[PDB]
Design a protein around this ligand. Sequence first.
Ligand SMILES: [Ca+2]
Length: 130
Amino acid sequence: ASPVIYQAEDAIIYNAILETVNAGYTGSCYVNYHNEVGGYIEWNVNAPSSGSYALIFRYANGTTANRPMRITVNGNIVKPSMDFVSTGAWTTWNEAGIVANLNQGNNVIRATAIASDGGPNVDYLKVFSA
Ligand SMILES: [Ca+2]
């Protein structure tokens, strides 16, 4: 499959902000989680058919500590604590990925900060669906 990129600029967010400070993001911005628990980002992701899809986040984590997130798909928690480990700098971007089942149609995919320092900075969500 070819990737479909769900850009930060198009995200639905909570206790998080669209930011452009740190170089190396793609599109027009990335999302920042406000250095606290509970914020999220979410997109409406089309699946042309039911099955397994790769969900890849491009992110930065300029701290030394893991910033894990809960991944929810259509209201069900598919990954209670997905790791987002240090990338070494706020300007160094890496990828983290999982596989999840999507339904034919729209899928609401959310990444929620579960740790006290919030989520990493997230560039986009890439889904191998096309
Ligand atoms: Ca971006």
